[PDB]
Design a protein around this ligand. Structure first.
Ligand SMILES: CN[C@@H]1[C@@H](O)[C@@H](O[C@@H]2[C@@H](O)[C@H](O[C@H]3OC(CN)=CC[C@H]3N)[C@@H](N)C[C@H]2N)OC[C@]1(C)O
Lengths: 265, 265
């Protein structure tokens, strides 16, 4: 009748989560069942399973409701500029679109938050420094990004009952894919500085839709499904939530190959 | 089309919130309208209106799902004791039942959280230290409590679209009322200490139901309505939210008189 940090940690180990791992989690908290400590049960269970040498990560993004106001160049009209709350990595909230866990992780003491607002990750544990450091402001899903560092460190991604098309790391595969017609997003972003608000234009491949035309909006889920069908990754219950645990490097390489086989040369 | 930190602060001033006030807030965030910065717009507007000499407060309580497991004496069964997350004033989440604003305020840098878990308040501003110090663990809605200090400080309570029966300060009027048949609650509470988890029995007047039998659950709303009908307190719009602003000392005395005239002598 109550899942605990102990029972979830047992389920996470059974799924394959290992001591010392860097684990990025996408959680559908309601699907886990009744939790004794609410969403913090999940965070605590992940820390217990990877141990103090491990790191727990989540896709933070930022709640920035102002995008409904920008013009044709992605710039904020002058009458609205000073009313837009600037981005502060330590104070700006994580987005709500994909659940409350990223914000809960962000407000856990010790958690660090990377500097690219729309692509920001939160990290808590031994490698939090490094995972959140020097997030490039342009093409924040590409080289030198926290997602790239997750691949480089041999990290893992856990879909904890979350829809499989919300696996943020596959946007890093989209960035790396050598294919034509990649869609681009440009938008002005306000940053909080010790001297005041500083505006900057951000450019990246658009992650609000598939990177190229001819793909269903939810096509990431099919890539993960084919990934599991090929004998890679693990499936199992975390609490009451059907969950998927995949290797970050392997799913990235699989995603890049998937796109280059259908749209490259 | 967008309520801002500037517009909300103007609405608060028009309603009567003043420079230097100590203001306790109960908010229905969705009723305020379209917010550029989400719930933090409300918090910022409140701080702008009262200034650095004022204090912004909210009823935190704490997330304690283990109460479903206690026996008739309020004690946690031994098989569950080790698994119940202990209370940490700086890390335990605010209860989510009455909206997210208390939790957002709790995670605002500088905010302090008082030590009585079930009765805890968060406070942010000049008098945060004083409001949250030495919260008595027994009868935490009574003498020496943060609610008592709000009356002592000449504070105010703002119902920002929130249902009028959620005005926590009226539990302090319940505590002060010289009436017979007051219901009492006893429950075991785990505290986080530098020594480990320390369990303590907490006793208070029951705030989960009216202080005496024969009262509608929502009778607090009738008291507030009568208070306004008598010509006290102010009503007005904060954004799109119908709001009520009352003097903390005046509504407490009014509530005590209301109870002592219908019960007791
Ligand atoms: C700058 N902040 C934001 C920016 O980061 C980005 O967010 C992306 C998000 O929409 C994508 O969601 C799409 O897929 C699904 C499937 N549940 C739901 C809604 C769909 N639109 C998500 N997969 C990847 C996010 N990076 O675009 C919006 C923004 C406000 O500009």
């Amino acid at each position: 009748s109550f899942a605990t940090r102990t029972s979830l940690a047992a389920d996470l180990a059974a799924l394959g989560l290992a001591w010392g791992d860097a684990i990025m989690v996408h959680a559908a908290v309601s699907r886990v069942g009744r939790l004794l400590d609410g969403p913090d049960t999940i965070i605590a269970a992940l820390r217990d399973t990877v141990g103090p040498g491990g790191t727990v990560l989540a896709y933070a993004d930022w709640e920035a409701r102002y995008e409904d106001l920008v013009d044709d160049a992605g710039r904020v009209p002058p009458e609205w500029r000073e009313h837009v709350p600037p981005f502060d990595p330590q104070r700006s909230r994580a987005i709500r679109d994909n659940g409350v866990l990223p914000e809960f992780l962000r407000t856990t003491p010790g958690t660090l938050r990377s500097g690219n607002p729309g692509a920001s990750l939160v990290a808590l544990g031994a490698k939090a420094e490094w995972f959140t450091a020097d997030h490039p402001l342009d093409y924040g899903y590409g080289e030198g990004s926290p997602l790239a560092k997750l691949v480089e460190a041999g990290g893992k991604v856990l879909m904890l009952g979350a829809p499989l098309d919300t696996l943020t790391l596959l946007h890093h595969a989209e960035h790396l894919a050598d294919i034509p017609g990649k869609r681009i997003k440009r938008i002005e972003v306000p940053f909080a500085t010790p001297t005041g608000t500083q505006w900057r234009m951000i450019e990246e491949f658009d992650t609000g839709d598939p990177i190229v035309a001819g793909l269903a909006e939810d096509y990431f889920a099919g890539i993960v499904t084919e990934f599991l069908a090929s004998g890679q990754g693990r499936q199992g219950l975390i609490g009451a939530a059907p969950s998927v645990l995949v290797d970050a490097a392997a799913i990235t390489a699989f995603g890049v190959t998937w796109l280059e086989k259908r749209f490259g040369t």
